């Protein structure tokens, strides 16, 4: 499968999990922003 | 074509001056009964899903409209 | 104020502000056998959520009231079901949480119909078949409770519907209006 | 020998490339062919009143 499609699917499930953790209260706002940009790397 | 969801609305349509055709449709596999009346602009159908209410409705329609059952395999 | 329709309970529901109070009145006819059955039914379900159920205060417990259900906005009408396990409260200016149905045996408050066309005024239960009537300012929408779907819309000519009541036969309505008109449907 | 005769008769109906063929329910078969074939099978053809 092309790397474009894989990067894309990896980014959605990483961003979906970060939203779920931030909504459930397991992380704070400031840790969520750092983890979002570490995922973007 | 429109749908009528109440019995006494259907009789009021059948008592209109332009009510021309009236048909009764048996669907035994789905166990439902359909009363359809034609009054020029639109075809109104009533889905009853009961044998007892269909027999009372058949006797309550005006005798001027010759109500007919739909025969299987239309020519 | 509305009574539980079952003759075996003698429970009163009162609408004061946002929160809904359920009490057991100290009446001459409250036999301790009837009181224990009244206690048991109303306490059977203790085993931003809408409808936070809670125990009232120590002052209110001694006075006679026993439960308290608080909602987001002030309510104006209470309707009971025939069996007595369901009751609904209409809260005007509650927006999508205007009509909330509460289950007494489960201590559960739900909003069945979110999108409501108009400002809700009064709701009622059907006397025979399972379905729900909700009356806005200019319409009375009939919902079937089993499939959670609208099956009928009743349109009186009222500018503002004040109240409505359903016949015990369940096929007729009387609609009251602030513009002086009584309408039979 | 009977295996080869059956295999040769299969090649008589078969074609090199697939063609659309008439089903046996559609074609009509003669009276004399049924009494002939059942006689090879050793069946009394007069007992079954094969003359319908």
């Amino acid at each position: 499968m092309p790397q474009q499609v894989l990067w894309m699917r990896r980014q959605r499930v990483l961003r979906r999990l970060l939203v779920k953790y931030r909504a459930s209260g397991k992380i704070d706002k400031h840790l969520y922003h750092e983890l979002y940009h570490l995922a973007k790397g | 074509p429109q749908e009528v969801s109440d019995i006494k609305k259907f009789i009021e349509i059948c008592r209109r001056k332009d009510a021309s055709a009236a048909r009764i449709k048996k669907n035994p596999k789905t166990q439902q009964i359909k009363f359809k009346v034609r009054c020029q602009r639109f075809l109104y159908t009533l889905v009853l899903k009961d044998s007892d209410k269909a027999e009372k409705l058949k006797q309550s329609l005006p005798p001027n409209l010759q109500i007919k059952d739909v025969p299987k395999r239309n020519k | 104020v509305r009574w539980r329709p079952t003759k075996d309970t003698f429970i009163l529901a009162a609408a004061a502000g946002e929160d809904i109070f359920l009490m057991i009145p100290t009446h001459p006819s409250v036999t301790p056998a009837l009181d224990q059955a009244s206690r048991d039914i109303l306490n059977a379900g203790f085993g931003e959520p809408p409808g936070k159920w809670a125990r009232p205060g120590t002052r209110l417990e001694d006075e006679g009231v026993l439960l308290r259900i608080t909602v987001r906005s002030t309510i104006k009408a209470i309707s009971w079901h025939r069996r007595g396990d369901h009751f609904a409260t209409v809260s005007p200016s509650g927006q999508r949480s205007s009509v909330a149905i509460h289950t007494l045996s489960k201590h559960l408050t739900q909003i069945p119909f979110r999108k409501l066309n108009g400002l809700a005024q009064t709701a009622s239960f059907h006397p025979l078949r399972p379905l729900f009537f909700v009356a806005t300012q200019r319409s009375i929408r009939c919902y079937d409770l089993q499939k959670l779907e609208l099956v009928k819309i009743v349109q009186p000519g009222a500018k503002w519907i004040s109240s409505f009541d359903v016949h015990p036969g369940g096929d007729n309505l009387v609609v009251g209006s602030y513009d002086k008109r009584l309408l039979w449907h | 020998e009977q295996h080869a005769l059956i295999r040769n008769e299969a090649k008589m109906r078969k074609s090199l490339k697939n063609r659309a063929i008439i089903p046996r329910k559609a074609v009509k078969k003669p009276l004399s062919q049924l009494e002939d074939h059942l006689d090879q099978l050793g069946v009394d053809t007069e007992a079954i009143g094969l003359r319908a």
Partner: protein
């Protein structure tokens, strides 16, 4: 725990004595496969004969009647009756052996 019943009716070919019902029962016991293999005929599938030239198959597994139509079609070719005997379905699970249409010459 569901039971499915199929009936193969060979009454007219058996009365003509051109179809051996006992040979068809032995054929069905050697060719019906249950778990991908033949000879695995346990309590899941049972084959019996009814005295009118009929074979009754009762299945507790997911046995298709199309499979039973495929096995009787195979038996007719082995008996050289494929050109003259046809399998039709006349009821919900009843398959009947009958002749093709014959024209007088």
């Amino acid at each position: 725990k569901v039971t499915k019943k199929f009936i193969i009716n060979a009454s007219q070919p058996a009365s003509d004595k051109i179809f051996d019902v006992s040979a068809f029962e032995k054929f069905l016991n050697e060719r019906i496969k249950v778990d991908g293999r033949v000879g695995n005929l346990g309590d899941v599938i049972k084959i019996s004969q009814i005295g009118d030239g009929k074979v009754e198959i009762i299945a507790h597994n997911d046995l298709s009647g199309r499979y039973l139509k495929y096995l009787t079609k195979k038996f007719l070719k082995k008996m050289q009756l494929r050109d003259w005997l046809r399998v039709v379905a006349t009821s919900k699970g009843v398959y009947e052996l009958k002749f093709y249409n014959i024209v007088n010459d």
